[PDB]
Design a protein around this nucleic acid. Structure first.
Ligand SMILES: OC[C@H]1O[C@@](CO)(O[C@H]2O[C@H](CO)[C@@H](O)[C@H](O)[C@H]2O)[C@@H](O)[C@@H]1O
Ligand SMILES: OC[C@H]1O[C@@](CO)(O[C@H]2O[C@H](CO)[C@@H](O)[C@H](O)[C@H]2O)[C@@H](O)[C@@H]1O
Ligand code: MG
Length: 580
DNA sequence: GCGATCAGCTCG
DNA sequence: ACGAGCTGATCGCA
């Protein structure tokens, strides 16, 4: 049965009530400078559909949109807010965002449209976006009649579902998590995305030319050593050259052919000179394809800026993700790849890049939640945690810790945070399970608090059906009760890791909110540009650096109060590369 | 022809 | 190992 609504030709007072469900549709996946195809409004007076060229040109409508006292309920308000920013229109007053509400209730559901969220509450009087717009090449905006009804039904669903969603969030003690954390953060991410990051395309193009020279030299050297030419980027072709023509040892398989992962080649290097050249070839190839050509494809020709999109409702732990481009995985470990960062520059003359990062936030959060005396004392003394762990596990003095001992203690620390398992550690340290198990046993002997927490959190997950973070984020773990060892073990590791990684996410998100409030009170021009899990990157006039050196770390350190201090390191410079 | 999966890489 | 995204090659078949 069709849904009644007014297809309006002009904006009326009735459409400007102080509370309504609002839909500002942007069909393009990437909403930057993208079209708004239609608008729907549902309030106490009825349901309305408005053509964008009409509503967005109306003084009364635009004023209503920017009036903070006129409340709106929406789905993915950030998408609309940014699309409107590109048009010079401000969106205010969003008091409820169905996408974020659904995400907090159950991130595993993968809710990416109104229909998926509505299904959670047995509401199905609305179609999934894919069914209306289609997918891939077939995707397209339907004719007005079909478009208008879809938008109205989405607005109607949002109007009906607000109370049910707020009620459950309240029962979960997540009401403040949505209203005081996620929704305000949404607006901040919108500003960051809209601002974008300036790219030195000339620099990138010159690096690309040099990589082309290097790749060509290594490419030939590879054919020379193999005695023939082949597609190096083909795991299958490569597999034949290595394990058949050259007779190299087969230490591990995959599926279709042989395994040629970097880990496998690292072990084969001793046998043949072609191996080292293949590893180098792959390193350069990744930089060229992904960080040179890939980046250049998404830079705006007119402004020379890249405008990422932060997915705020995807990860199972509460972390953010980044796309088109992904600015959370720019090279830094290897020097050659790290040079890529010299291409990210300030958006204005005489401005600089400022980067601040939490030091060991995950292990600090663990010390807090586990209340391990030895680990809390370690951070209270601000000790090098990997050296300290080596001292305890191997029973030696600080002076007796060798480079290899610290390396292995470091690996034990990662396993503990990720969810420790002898197989996982053994695989990572290239040692036997028995040995890895010994390392773990030794660790728990030195940190009995962490051991009790790991045992207790797994038990809690089984009793409650989920685990939670510091700010009450939730993750359900149904596989925790599986009678299949591999499936159950994975869920146990998630029970152990989620409260750590998740609480660290909670903290940096609150820090972003606190920081923006501080920047505004101080009327600083500085503004956030990116967030990379445990680090915040800003840009500002060179004249604001000294003030930021004090303000940013403090805000980030005081975001929450834990049983151990929080530590933040910071750097600034002419490019992102220099902010170290 | 197109889209989906595998295999590889980058980051925290 | 925990949590993500992007690219080149290839297995898919409409
Ligand atoms: O707008 C981001 C928001 O939209 C979802 C779907 O509701 O993802 C869409 O947009 C992303 C950014 O362009 C794409 O990566 C994704 O493929 C597309 O479906 C949500 O997941 C996200 O929170
Ligand atoms: O041996 C107990 C020890 O095993 C773990 C797995 O590392 O959990 C197993 O035993 C529990 C009973 O004590 C079960 O609830 C759980 O399902 C099973 O995998 C640890 O959590 C526990 O300390
Ligand atoms: Mg750090």
């Amino acid at each position: 049965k069709k849904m009644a609504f007014t297809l309006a030709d002009r904006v009326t007072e009735e459409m400007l009530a102080d509370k309504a469900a609002l839909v500002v549709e942007v069909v393009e996946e990437n909403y930057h400078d993208a079209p708004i195809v239609g608008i729907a409004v549902v309030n106490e007076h009825g349901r309305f559909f408005l053509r964008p060229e009409t509503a967005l040109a109306d003084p009364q409508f635009v004023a209503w949109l920017g009036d903070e006292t006129k409340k709106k309920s929406m789905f993915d308000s950030k998408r609309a807010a940014v699309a409107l920013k590109w048009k010079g229109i401000e969106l205010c007053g969003v008091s409820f965002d169905l996408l974020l509400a659904a995400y907090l209730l159950d991130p595993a559901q993968g809710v990416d449209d109104v229909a998926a969220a509505a299904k959670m509450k047995q509401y199905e009087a609305v179609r999934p976006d894919e069914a209306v717009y289609g997918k891939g090449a077939k995707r397209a905006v339907p004719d007005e009649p079909v478009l208008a009804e879809h938008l109205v039904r989405k607005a109607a669903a949002i109007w009906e579902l607000e109370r049910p969603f707020l009620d459950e969030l309240r029962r979960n003690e997540q009401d403040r998590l949505l209203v005081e954390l996620e929704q305000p953060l949404s607006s901040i991410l919108a500003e960051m995305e809209f601002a974008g990051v300036k790219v030195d395309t000339k620099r990138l193009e010159q690096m690309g030319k040099e990589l082309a020279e290097q790749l060509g030299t290594v490419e030939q050297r590879i054919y020379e050593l193999a005695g023939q030419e082949f597609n190096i980027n083909s795991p299958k072709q490569l597999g034949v050259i290595l394990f058949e023509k050259l007779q190299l040892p087969v230490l591990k398989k995959t599926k279709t052919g042989y395994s040629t992962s970097a880990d496998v080649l690292e072990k084969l290097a001793p046998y043949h000179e072609i191996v080292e050249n293949i590893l180098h070839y792959r390193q350069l190839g990744k930089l060229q394809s992904t960080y040179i050509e890939g980046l250049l494809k998404v830079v705006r020709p007119d402004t020379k800026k890249v405008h990422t999109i932060f997915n705020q409702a995807l990860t199972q732990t509460g972390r953010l993700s980044s796309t088109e481009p992904n600015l959370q995985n720019i090279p830094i470990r290897l020097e050659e790849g790290r040079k890529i960062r010299q291409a990210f520059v300030p958006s204005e003359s005489d401005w600089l890049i400022f980067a601040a990062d939490y030091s060991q936030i995950e292990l600090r959060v663990l010390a807090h939640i586990a209340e391990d005396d030895n680990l809390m004392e370690a951070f209270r003394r601000d000790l090098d945690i990997h050296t300290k762990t080596a001292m305890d596990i191997f029973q030696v003095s600080e002076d007796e810790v060798t480079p290899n001992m610290r390396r292995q203690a470091k690996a034990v620390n990662f396993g503990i945070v990720y969810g420790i398992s002898d197989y996982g550690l053994a695989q990572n340290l290239n040692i036997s399970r028995k040995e890895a198990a010994e390392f773990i046993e030794r660790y728990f002997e030195s940190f009995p608090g962490v051991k009790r927490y790991m045992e207790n959190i797994v038990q809690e997950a089984k009793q409650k059906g989920y685990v939670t973070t510091l700010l009450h984020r939730r993750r359900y773990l149904p596989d925790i009760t599986s009678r299949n060892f591999n499936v159950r073990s994975f869920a146990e590791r998630m029970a152990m890791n989620t409260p750590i990684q998740g609480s660290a996410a909670d903290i940096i998100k609150k820090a972003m909110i606190d920081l923006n409030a501080r920047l505004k009170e101080e009327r600083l021009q500085a503004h956030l540009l990116l967030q990379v899990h445990d680090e915040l990157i800003l840009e500002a006039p060179k004249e604001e650096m000294e003030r930021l050196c004090r303000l940013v770390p403090e805000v980030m350190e005081q975001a929450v109060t834990l049983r151990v201090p929080l530590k933040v390191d910071y750097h600034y410079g002419s490019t992102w590369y220099d902010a170290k």
